[PDB]
Amino acid sequence: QATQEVKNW
Amino acid sequence: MQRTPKIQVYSRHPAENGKSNFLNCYVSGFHPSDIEVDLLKNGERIEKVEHSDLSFSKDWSFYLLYYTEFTPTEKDEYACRVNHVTLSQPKIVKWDRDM
Amino acid sequence: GSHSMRYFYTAMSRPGRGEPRFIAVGYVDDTQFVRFDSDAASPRMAPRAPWIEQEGPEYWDGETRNMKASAQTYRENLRIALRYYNQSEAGSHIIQVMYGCDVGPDGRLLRGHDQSAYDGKDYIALNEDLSSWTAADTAAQITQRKWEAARVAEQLRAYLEGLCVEWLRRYLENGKETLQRADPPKTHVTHHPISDHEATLRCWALGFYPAEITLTWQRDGEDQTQDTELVETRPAGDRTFQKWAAVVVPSGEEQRYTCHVQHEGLPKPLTLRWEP
Numbered sequence: 001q002a003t004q005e006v007k008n009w
Numbered sequence: 010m011q012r013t014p015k016i017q018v019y020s021r022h023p024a025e026n027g028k029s030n031f032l033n034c035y036v037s038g039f040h041p042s043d044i045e046v047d048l049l050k051n052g053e054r055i056e057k058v059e060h061s062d063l064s065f066s067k068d069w070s071f072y073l074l075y076y077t078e079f080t081p082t083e084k085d086e087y088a089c090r091v092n093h094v095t096l097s098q099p100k101i102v103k104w105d106r107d108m
Numbered sequence: 109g110s111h112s113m114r115y116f117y118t119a120m121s122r123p124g125r126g127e128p129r130f131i132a133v134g135y136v137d138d139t140q141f142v143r144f145d146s147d148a149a150s151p152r153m154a155p156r157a158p159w160i161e162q163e164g165p166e167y168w169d170g171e172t173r174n175m176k177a178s179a180q181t182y183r184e185n186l187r188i189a190l191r192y193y194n195q196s197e198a199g200s201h202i203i204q205v206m207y208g209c210d211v212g213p214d215g216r217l218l219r220g221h222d223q224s225a226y227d228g229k230d231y232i233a234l235n236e237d238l239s240s241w242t243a244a245d246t247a248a249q250i251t252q253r254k255w256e257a258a259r260v261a262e263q264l265r266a267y268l269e270g271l272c273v274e275w276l277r278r279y280l281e282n283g284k285e286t287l288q289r290a291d292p293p294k295t296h297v298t299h300h301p302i303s304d305h306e307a308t309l310r311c312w313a314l315g316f317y318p319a320e321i322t323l324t325w326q327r328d329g330e331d332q333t334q335d336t337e338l339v340e341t342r343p344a345g346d347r348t349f350q351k352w353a354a355v356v357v358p359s360g361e362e363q364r365y366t367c368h369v370q371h372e373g374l375p376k377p378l379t380l381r382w383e384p
Binding site: 022 | 339
């Protein structure tokens with residue numbers, strides 16, 4: 001299962 | 010900042026004339042990811058070739074497997090033809106059943 | 109033995125040819141099991157291994173929702189990267205990401221990974237502590253400061269120690285017939301004269317899984333590292349891999365050469381020679 005993005009660059 | 014593809018042309022199983030097999034063209038080590046690959050039979054493009062999903066190595070360079078079913082014979086010549094931004098002209102690598 | 113799970117993202121801008129393409133693939137060891145492509149007619153997280161197909165619609169809908177959101181995030185990150193490198197909106201650029209977890213034979217976390225690149229060069233990496241970052245340049249230091257302020261590492265650590273290893277353990281069990289089976293290489297040496305006084309010996313390894321292998325030539329028991337031609341390990345297309353190693357030898361000296369093969373499917377390393 002993939003993880004979710006937390007913050008942009 | 011660009012890396013030219015390495016190219017290997019080979020079969021899934023040891024080649025036996027008249028026995029069905031898969032012809033593989035493995036392109037790797039290249040960057041950026043856009044790349045044009047044709048498999049050729051006696052110089053002509055084979056239709057409906059399939060390819061793997063784009064992935065990449067620990068050094069960020071990309072790799073792809075192109076493949077098609079084929080039945081090798083004594084006289085038929087196979088190759089894969091590759092174009093990439095790093096190449097002035099398409100590179101043709103002939104299938105050598107001992108490589 | 110030990111196992112890994114990895115997700116690989118590639119986001120590629122293409123000004124004048126639409127929004128950036130986003131492709132994600134997931135692997136367990138050397139076995140791909142999912143894919144997502146934003147250019148597909150109907151983009152979805154889709155199965156690529158038989159043992160993942162049994163996951164239910166909640167799984168597939170959640171993975172698809174995440175991938176669509178991640179594609180949007182990386183489209184935003186490509187625009188941000190232009191500002192960080194003083195680049196124009198005319199050129200094509202690529203962000204790559206790889207992340208995931210390694211477990212030991214007992215299923216416990218061995219180490220976690222979360223590393224990114226811009227245009228094929230290291231950008232930022234989560235350190236092995238899963239708490240601090242290594243930035244490759246002053247642009248990635250801007251990202252580092254943002255991610256330190258937002259405690260991003262804590263959230264990634266929670267994934268890497270938790271859901272990452274839990275799902276990996278589940279996949280290993282559901283795919284135990286293949287993911288937990290090593291296939292040893294089938295090996296042989298071929299001989300090709302080059303001239304009247306030199307010949308090529310080529311040591312072949314075929315049909316093996318996983319891809320990690322060592323093929324070495326020795327001459328009189330001494331490794332021939334600087335004199336060996338070694339091709340990149342290549343996929344056969346049936347989950348297996350192939351590799352060969354070649355040396356050019358003086359005619360009449362072939363029996364002084366031995367090929368050595370190490371692979372996790374072999375109980376012991378193998379020694380082979382040309383058999384005329």
